[PDB]
Design an enzyme around this catalytic site. Sequence first.
Site, PDB file in Angstrom:
ATOM      1  N   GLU A 116       0.851  -1.196   0.000  1.00 40.61           N
ATOM      2  CA  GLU A 116       0.000   0.000   0.000  1.00 40.61           C
ATOM      3  C   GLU A 116       0.890   1.249   0.000  1.00 40.61           C
ATOM      4  O   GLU A 116       0.880   2.088   0.912  1.00 40.61           O
ATOM      5  CB  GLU A 116      -1.065  -0.057   1.101  1.00 40.61           C
ATOM      6  CG  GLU A 116      -2.043  -1.223   0.846  1.00 40.61           C
ATOM      7  CD  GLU A 116      -3.339  -1.136   1.634  1.00 40.61           C
ATOM      8  OE1 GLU A 116      -4.399  -1.451   1.048  1.00 40.61           O
ATOM      9  OE2 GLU A 116      -3.309  -0.763   2.833  1.00 40.61           O
ATOM     10  N   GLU A 212      -4.692  -7.838  -1.664  1.00 38.71           N
ATOM     11  CA  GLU A 212      -5.590  -7.867  -0.516  1.00 38.71           C
ATOM     12  C   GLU A 212      -6.987  -7.870  -1.091  1.00 38.71           C
ATOM     13  O   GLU A 212      -7.314  -7.013  -1.913  1.00 38.71           O
ATOM     14  CB  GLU A 212      -5.377  -6.663   0.411  1.00 38.71           C
ATOM     15  CG  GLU A 212      -4.016  -6.669   1.083  1.00 38.71           C
ATOM     16  CD  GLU A 212      -3.754  -5.427   1.916  1.00 38.71           C
ATOM     17  OE1 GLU A 212      -4.579  -5.129   2.817  1.00 38.71           O
ATOM     18  OE2 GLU A 212      -2.719  -4.762   1.672  1.00 38.71           O
TER      19      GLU A 212
END
Length: 324
Positions: A116, A212
């Site tokens: 991220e 994810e």
Amino acid sequence: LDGVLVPESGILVSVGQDVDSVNDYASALGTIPAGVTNYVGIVNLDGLNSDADAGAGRNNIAELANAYPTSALVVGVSMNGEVDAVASGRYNANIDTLLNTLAGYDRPVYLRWAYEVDGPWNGHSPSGIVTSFQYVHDRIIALGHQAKISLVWQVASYCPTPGGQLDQWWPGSEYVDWVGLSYFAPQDCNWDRVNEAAQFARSKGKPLFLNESTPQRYQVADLTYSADPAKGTNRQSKTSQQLWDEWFAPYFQFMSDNSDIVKGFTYINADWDSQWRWAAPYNEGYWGDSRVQANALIKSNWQQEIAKGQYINHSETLFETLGY
Ligand SMILES: [Mg+2]
């Protein structure tokens, strides 16, 4: 590294993202997952050789690797708020130990470095991200592990962060093997962020990994949905078919719509609600329960979908298929 662990065709099916949830999935579905996923922090190497539990499930890469010896290993590496110190070299011995340890498992490893990358909460600087990706790519070669470790640049693809801001985080195609994204509640902005990430990967000529994924704000066992991302209030009953059609069907459709580039996903299969970071009264967001085994229809539909021929599941030829 440099594309050797990207399958020529097919989509790697992996599951995450703590040891116990992965074990529960494997047992409930009577299957060996093709890939299994855990996290390590670069500052302490927490979760690498012994238990780390910070309320998001227990991580222990040594235990996971031993439990799934013929599965790919997917590892998210947090900078723990210190990417600038990492870029400055203060964790270089830890990086070597991480890379050497993962290479010692003699299997495909997908390394989501500073995962991220564009999530503001991670405290990253663009310079620290670009520099550290270059460093890690080059260090993998220097240590001789380029046949074993594939470097993933995973964005957050999170609706509240404005679009159009990816370029500053990109280290260059020379240093990245996959673009990754997070697929949680993309419907909140009409799939704009996940589509932008896919288009970015496409433009760079990189494969896409959905690193994810979960039906965020849904509860599989309870069969509910909440529109409230903070605290999961005003929960609405859903039929199991509705839950499938609302989140699972568009998730698999997204892979099909991006079939030129999608080569892997990690499905997070967990009772998030039971893990203290993600638990009531929800101080760090509302997550739910994503265990496909917690509903018979969801379980059956899941099994039926991932059995299809475009998916790479576990077999004796898995490592060869993944370029190992
Ligand atoms: Mg590679």
